Symmetry: D2
Subunit: 292 residues, 4 copies
Amino acid sequence: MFTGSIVAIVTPMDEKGNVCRASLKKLIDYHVASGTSAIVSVGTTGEWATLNHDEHADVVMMTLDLADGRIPVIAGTGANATAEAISLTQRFNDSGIVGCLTVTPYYNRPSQEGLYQHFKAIAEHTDLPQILYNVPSRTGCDLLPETVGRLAKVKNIIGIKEATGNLTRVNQIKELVSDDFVLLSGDDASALDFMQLGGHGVISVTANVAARDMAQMCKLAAEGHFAEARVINQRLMPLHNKLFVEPNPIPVKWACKELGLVATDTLRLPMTPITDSGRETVRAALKHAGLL
Amino acid sequence: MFTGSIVAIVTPMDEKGNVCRASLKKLIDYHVASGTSAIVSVGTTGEWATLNHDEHADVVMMTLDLADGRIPVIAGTGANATAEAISLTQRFNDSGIVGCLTVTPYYNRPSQEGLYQHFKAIAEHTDLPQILYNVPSRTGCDLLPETVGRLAKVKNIIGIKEATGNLTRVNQIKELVSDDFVLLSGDDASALDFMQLGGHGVISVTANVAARDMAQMCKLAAEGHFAEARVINQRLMPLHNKLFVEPNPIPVKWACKELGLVATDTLRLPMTPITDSGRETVRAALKHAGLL
Amino acid sequence: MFTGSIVAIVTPMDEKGNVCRASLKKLIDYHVASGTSAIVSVGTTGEWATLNHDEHADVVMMTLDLADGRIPVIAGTGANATAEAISLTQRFNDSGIVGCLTVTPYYNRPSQEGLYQHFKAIAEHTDLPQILYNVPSRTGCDLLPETVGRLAKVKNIIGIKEATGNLTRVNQIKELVSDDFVLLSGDDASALDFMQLGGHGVISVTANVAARDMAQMCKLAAEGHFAEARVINQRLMPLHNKLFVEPNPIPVKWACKELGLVATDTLRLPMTPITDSGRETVRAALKHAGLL
Amino acid sequence: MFTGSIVAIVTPMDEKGNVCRASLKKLIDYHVASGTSAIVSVGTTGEWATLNHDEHADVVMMTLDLADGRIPVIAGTGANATAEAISLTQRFNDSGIVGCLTVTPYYNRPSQEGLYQHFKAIAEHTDLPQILYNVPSRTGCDLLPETVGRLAKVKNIIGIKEATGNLTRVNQIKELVSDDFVLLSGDDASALDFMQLGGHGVISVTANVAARDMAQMCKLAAEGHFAEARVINQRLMPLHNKLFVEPNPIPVKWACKELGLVATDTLRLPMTPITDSGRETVRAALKHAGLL
Ligand SMILES: [K+]
Ligand SMILES: [K+]
Ligand SMILES: [K+]
Ligand SMILES: [K+]
């Protein structure tokens, strides 16, 4: 469901840039075994931006097939044209995903009123639950609490991935929504803080390579054991930062390959292969988390 | 032609959101008559964000058909996947456009090296002149002068639309590139300053409703008559700011409707109709410019 | 001591700009009666910047005299020259204050190494406890966690007033310091959040006019009753924001006068009297907090 | 004289932090010989922050004594209390300085109206020309063009040192003030751009070690020979940036020592000695400029 440690899973690729089915299966089994609560398929970390709509759908369908009911699957579904968002979401009706992660229109910088209409329209054309995704550093566009409050009144809009790293948002949004609207961090480095303020979990990049620690950290948090949780957190903190030493998902894909979870660390342009210096930095962070 | 007042033309729509050929013809005749140097078809102001590839190609071909050789046309062609930019660009080879305006990958936040390989590859697969477009407020990524210097060495990368509003960039870029590389403002409120520092022109929103004044201002700036160009700029300055009182192209499409240049001011969601307050502000700016 | 609700008390003045002893007594009694834990005398809210050093000392001595052992007194003691900071601190040795609130040098923007030497030197020339005060929006200068960690190793440096409003700081600093280094918020609007993350109290502007609510909110927080605490918080939140609708301490002085706690709302230039529109805004916030 | 290359002169100190009269005389003779238009005594670069009022007056009187009528001297006189600025200013009336450089109140963050009443009052109580100084990175407050327009109507407020590095301000200010109001850059890296937009000169840090080049660059800019001025600016550009590799005036005092212009590079805490790495960077910048 929508709590605990949710992975924004990489889209592993062969040397040609196409999805690697064996690698994907290996990651999906690693999650099922690790206690991960759900998989976000073709989020930002899954290279949503460089997959075409059919390739995106293939990866989601494949991911659901390979999950085989053992672990719920959320699909990335954002578009910055409201009509395109509706169409793309319609594709996944009756597919088996439990929900959609739908990104704020990126680029065209709508007003808060436009954001409200965009998401309200998306929600009205599906029965799938919708998790709003706010990530202003990528989109140029900031979904404010007041607007999240308005959107939470729509039946199937059920939570938000808050990736600003701005922790005052947690309670500004909580005071405006019902007790079962979910609040998930999209910022690994502040996610334990976010849960300590009342957040319900995290859509994590770090969980790609430390799924068990991340799932244990979020059980502890949800139980009120923040000081036990922080010990795992300090173990992971260099990763939470150094998985962004170069643009995501360049580091986390390299790390997945170095840990043997995927066959190649290939990405699509304009993402570039990891630099030597980035490799050493990520290597050190992995050693610190006790994974090499 | 890649100097002077270049308009980033609105894509005029009927009440259903479909391109209105009659309104487009009127705009194009207006720019031919008013001395505009060229037309950017389906840029940001032309709602690039919300047109699919079919409509995008149609608008560009219709603009070329209506222009009928009387004014150069440049297409917006950016994409955040390098493969898709290359592919959209191929579709316009031998179309009759003189050039492409290609935006930095938005959303995925590539490194400078990524940006370099992106634009180099797009350029490698066409004969068309390419104009790089930097607009960090929309893309979350900033093409730096050093990278622009490296890209200018590629034969058909011929200029930049610099939309940061950061005037330091003009001479940082100019000292790294050859004398025939074109520097074009993409920020109307600072465009005269940009030209006085050595910029060659402006790709303008304001030009949609003040074509003649913009063309004369740019010609005066080109000859060095800055005090004279600034008289004109001071009467346009309220438009230069208030055409962004709500998200572009909401205000400018309203203005074009109020002047009678287009039949409706309809846009595509997530752009919303102009508010009553925006209407009052834009109307006062038009009156300050002497257009109403 | 250094926990709970600490007031950054206004320096009430007569129509001529000099300290008003009757008004000060009335505020000090109101605090003693309200449960306020301590008084910061001649902090930022007390107009430290527009009092000369003798006037500053007079206000501190007067405040301690009037407190008459009923409530501990911390003096503002910052200087941006390290020698001047030491001298100014020496004045208060053996005076009766329990500690100093010492601001980061403002203006000259030292390195982190310079900040470390400045504060280490101050601490070495007094036996008074020192609370570091980080407030980058006023000083242009940001004391980072790593540097706070180094400074906390000095015997008499015992806590920090963190006024950035950046809540990730609470745990970044906690993991680098011992369990009895104190962490106090300097940002009223985020202070309950700050305490919920592990902070020990707040040096508050809002407590000037809502001392009892603020003291009750921080007892509840310290006891783990965050949801009871939040109800008081939502009552006060318009105040926490609107006490800065004009520069502090302009609004809070007007509010103190409107509630009858001080005789005049006079301030020293370049602080100006409250605007009409600001008066109505602050009035509304007071009505909301149930104080008019 | 308030045009051309104006140096913000270092205050050279012996090993004990006391003003070194011999080093000061050498600097002053150097600026007379190198064509510098004037000297700003005890500005930011002159460690205004860390001198008390006694030392501040001494340095200014010693500079006037050594200059001996050969070059105009301007004093730094800002304060964040209006009463104290008025008072420091009175101390220099009939001293022989031609003007004051008065900084916006730092730290207390006054409103635009506050700033207006501040500078108007300072100006009302002197016959000396006043030059407003805007440096938001140090003061936390930004004097806006509209306020500058209002202040220019006061008879003896004659110009502004604009240190934001925001080049849009030049023509926003210039259109609101009369033709004899002086606009002076306070940001060396953007100063040539500032002049090309219509600025009249620069109050410069770089001028401390490259006097002659700075004076020639400013004269060429004044006559409109921008391409020629830019050759000089490109050789100074590493200094313009690297003299801030560590907090000003750490690097420039080191540079003056390495050139032999001052006996020691001692500063007052919280400024610290230059690091080994800063030394290497500044030395390479001096060699790029042709000074070593
Ligand atoms: K709902
Ligand atoms: K080229
Ligand atoms: K200590
Ligand atoms: K004047």
